[model samples]
Each structure stands twice: as C-alpha cells, then as structure tokens.
Target chain A: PQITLWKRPLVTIKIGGQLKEALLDTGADDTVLEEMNLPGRWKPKMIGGIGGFIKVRQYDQILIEICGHKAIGTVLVGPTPVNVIGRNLLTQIGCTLNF
Target chain B: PQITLWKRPLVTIKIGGQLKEALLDTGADDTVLEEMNLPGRWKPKMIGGIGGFIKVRQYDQILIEICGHKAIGTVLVGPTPVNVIGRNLLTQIGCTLNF
Candidate 1:
C-alpha cells in the first residue's frame, strides 16, 4: 500500500490553555506564536523587523515532541491565526520532508 | 572577573548582495530577514499570524554560519530594516547565550 503524506507530522500545542494544531513549517525561519492567544506575563518589547522595528513580546519556551523527537524552543507571540514552526527548530536534527 | 557579555556575537550576512551586520537575538523567536533591503528575485507571500495572514513573498534560503555552526532556513520578505535571528535558528543546536 502506497501512502502519500501531505506534510510532515506536526505536533499540537496548547495556547491560552487551548489546544491549537499547527504545521511544522520548516520553510519558515521563525517560531511564530499568536499574540492574541499567548499566556499572560510574556511581556512584549518593541523590536525591529525586515519591514521596520515592530513591537514583539517574549514568552515561555515550549517543548515540542513528534514521533519521539523533542525540541525546546521559544515562540513569537503574534496575532495571526496560523502559527508556523520555522527552520530554527528544523535544523537541530537531520530533517527531511517526505514528498 | 566582572566582565559581562551584553549580547551574543552575531555574524554579518549579505542581503541583496550587500553585507549587513545583525545581532543574534536569542530572545527573538523567528528567522526574520528584512524585506526592504532584500534581493531582487525574492517576493512577498501572504502569511497568517495571530492578527491575520499577511502576504510574504518567498526568496532563496541563505546559509548562516556562526561560531562554526551553520543552519539553512527560509526568510519572510518584508519591507523593514532590522533583521533578527530568532529561536527558529537558536534551539536547533541547544544554544545558550551569555550575558
């Protein structure tokens, strides 16, 4: 039986005490989190970006485990509905996406 | 010795064929490349965030080497000035920053 995998297996994370399923977007180079759903106490600071300097608050790092693979990393608290797991987390292991 | 390291040593990367010096901000959670000062082939693609999904064109992946470590990652093409090295690249190697 030939099975096609659309994307790599992704892990589910809890945000604002709710489970939010996200893609392990290795193409993305950053660990972006939803600013609106972040835990309280992660104070955001004004930081610069490629566009210009924007305001970004920091938060606690989360441990992501997939198929027994685990990584500890921080995430950006943004206000977008789609959160991406960037390449920063991908390069830690010898990563390969099954097409 | 009371000498304190304010921030980690960062590397200089070339954007749009021009060399730019950036700081390795472990506090940052994403691998952010400046949109404004990017190369010609790179375009923006609409990306989703906690606020909403915005268009951010894609570009070539750049190899960033620091302290004899290298990582391959994609960047979000934006129109800003400051480029940050986020946790997307940090946690990959069990990185620890000195202050």
Candidate 2:
C-alpha cells in the first residue's frame, strides 16, 4: 500500500495547567477552543465572521514543543472538538503546504 | 482520580478528504488547522492579530460528529501545533463556557 506522509510540526501547550501535545495550524486565521475533557479558564469574546459575528473566549496560553520546535502560544482552556493551529504562530517557523 | 467533564455539543468536520470528529468551540474566533497526519487542499489567506499580521491557508473542510451531534464545517487541512474550535460555528449550537 502507498501512503503519503504529511507531517509538519508538533507543540506542547499548557491546558488546565497541564502540558499536553498539540498540532500547529498556520492555515487558521484566529485561535479556537473546545469545551470537553479538559480544565482551565474560559474568557469569552465576540468575533466577526463571513456570515456575521460570533462570541468566543480565551482559555489559556501555554508553552509547546513541536517537531523539536518549541514556542509559547494560546490554547483553548477546556475540552475542544479539535485543536487548531492558526497563522498567528505559524509564520514563525516558515512552513509550507503541499496539495 | 476526580474528573470533571464539561461536555458540550460537538460537530463533525472533514479533513484531508475524510470525516473526522470535532468540537464546536464558542470560545474561538476562526477556523484553524494542524500541519500533520492529514491530507487536502490549503487555501492561503492573510490575517491580522495582536502580534501583527500573518498569512494562513485552508487545508480542508469535511463533515464531523461530536457528542452524537453532527454538522458540516471547515477544518484546517494540515498538521498543526494545536487545533482550535472557533466561535463562528459554536454559537449556532448555543454553548457556554465555565471557568
């Protein structure tokens, strides 16, 4: 079987005061959070989107290590549907996307 | 061990041409992506943040299932340092955050 290996970088973030592993996404425009099996602070904010506007919050910003790379950024403080990496941090490492 | 489950509604999203489970985060502002272990298209976009400004892209958007709930939303199409759930789709489900 043929498989395509798509790996960029990984980072560790502090969630609920714990350092957990996460993937960074430079493709995202803003930060996100999920309310699931985690713990921390949930600071809410209102945002504008393609449709209209939405309210969101900030949970925490922690230190993370990815692909032997380390950096400090914000992570949603609670359990989330998915972890997302946004453009705010991605530009630091100089990454690229392949179709 | 004592664990607190802040269970909320989840929506499904497609990534790299596959349906994966995701959470709807009312605390996030934009869709994010991880730059690892996935496949799909990445559409680049520029964004402004507190630090300054950065460019990001859209890897893919697929269907997802969360907490027995389902919806179609956009997911970042790559491996990232962290995955974020933004507010755009979260408000649709009516969610709240607990600190």
Candidate 3:
C-alpha cells in the first residue's frame, strides 16, 4: 500500500478499540499517543523530542491497527501535542521510505 | 530509491555545498536545519513542533540534494535540535509512505 505525503503524513489508526488520527513520525523511536485509558498496567518512561522530554506511561503488548494492518506493540500514553505512530509500529506493517 | 526505516530515518543531504545528516520527519510541515550560513536573503518566520514554536530565517530557492536527488525549495534555518527534512523537500523528491 502507498500513502501520499500531505502537509503532514497523517493516518487513521485503531488502538484499544478506539479510532484516532496519528502522525506517521519516522523520526520518533516509539509510538506516543495523547493520554488515553486502557485496561493494563504500565511503566513510567520518558521520551525526548525536538524541544524537550516528557513523562509517559508505557503500555506493552497492545493491539494497534494501521491502514488495515494489525500489530501488537508498545504504546506510550503521554501529554503529547499529537499522536505519533513511530518506527516501532511502522516496522510491523513493513513500511518503507521511498522516493 | 527505497530507504529502510531505522529508529529514525536519517539520510545525508547536501545543502549550501555542505553535506549534513537530517531526519526524514513526516510530522513536520517545513524543512528545518541547524543554524548555518547560506548565501541568500531570507525572511523571518516562525515554526512550531512537538513542544513549541521558534523563530527562523526562511530562505527560498535553495538547492538541496537528498539521496542522489536534487531539489530546489525553501529551507528554514533556526536553532533546531536536529535537522529535519520535511514534506517540503520530500515532495520534490517524489517520496512516498509505503508498506
């Protein structure tokens, strides 16, 4: 499947049975979602970005659906300005950067 | 050309006759580079990222080379933590997000 780059590369994703739009951020190492409620225990972790670092709850073994492809991976719940689907989940879908 | 996604999809780019590494950031709207002196007249502008906005000097008609491809576009120079090749430059190279 091929996706076009817009002002921002955004796609719909399903996590914890909820549908949301997230940025496809290859620059990010892990998937970071805006604070959400899920049914499992998580560990506290910190992630750094272009500006600074933020504390997050890392929930492991979560099911995520992106572009119809399903993958189970770690999702970090944090106070992110936007939801980002990083390399962690992009790998599961066999995503590649092409020119 | 096909590029694999690493923790961060980084690639070498040539700008202002200097080679530099930059992250392929689909989440960013404009291309930003760490402060460098280029031969051009630029206008002042502001760009926002994960944390906040920063002042930048927007230089137009700059030639940039990425992955053996040449593109002429606008490049923003600012105090960026990292160099980001955003959609502005990616589009010129006909880049796509694929799985």
Whose TM-score is greatest here?
3
Lowest-lDDT window of 10 residues in candidate 3 chain B? B1-10
Q: lDDT per prediction?
A: 0.49, 0.43, 0.87
Residue-level lDDT of model 3, residues B33-58, one tens digit each, is 99999997999998876666778999
Model 1 lDDT tens row, A1-99: 111122233457554556666555433455565545554467665533333344566665655543334556666666434555555554443343221
Candidates' chain B TM-scores in the order shown: 0.53, 0.50, 0.95
**Can you give the lDDT of residue B28 in candidate 2?**
40
> Which portions of model 3 show Cα errors greater than 4 Å?
none
Q: Which candidate is the best by DockQ?
A: 3
lDDT by residue for model 2 (A19-81), tens:
555544433454454544444555666544322344456645554444444545664433333
Error of model 3, residue A14, in angstroms: 1.0
Off by over 4 Å in 2: A1-99, B1-25, B36-42, B59-61, B77-80, B97-99
On residues A1-99, what C-alpha lDDT tens digit does candidate 3 reach at each position? 887776677889999889999988877788999999988899999887556678999999999999899988899998899999989989888988898
The 10-residue segment with the lowest total lDDT in model 1 chain A: A1-10
True contacts kept of 3: 0.69
